[PDB]
Amino acid sequence: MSETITVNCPTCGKTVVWGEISPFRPFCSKRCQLIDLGEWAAEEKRIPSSGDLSESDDWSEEPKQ
Ligand SMILES: [Zn+2]
């Protein structure tokens, strides 16, 4: 209703209705729009836990720490 164009999700490939009718006009899901940018990894925001054995592989880990 009132502008109802369908946009295809560029992350998974799905026809999602855009305009004034559905709650998620942009992308089919929140995760699809997220991965679309490319700044979301298994971690939330940086990894505070570091050390132990082979934990947090980001820079200079080594088998000693
Ligand atoms: Zn999608």
CATH number reported for the structural domain that contains residue 28 in this entry: 3.30.50.10
CA–centroid distance, residue 16 to ligand 1 (Å): 8
DSSP H helices in the chain: 30-37
d(CA 21, CA 54): 49
On whether 2 is known to bind a ligand per the annotation, the reply is: no
On whether 12 is known to bind a ligand per the annotation, the reply is: yes
On whether 3 is known to bind a ligand per the annotation, the reply is: no
DSSP secondary structure code for residue 55 in this structure: B
User: Per the structure, how many domains does the chain have?
Assistant: 1
Experimental approach was NMR
Structural domain span for residue 41: 1-65
Q: What is the CA radius of gyration of the chain?
A: 19
Greatest CA separation for the chain? 63
Quote the strand ranges of the chain, DSSP E.
6-8, 15-17
CA–centroid distance, residue 57 to ligand 1 (Å): 29
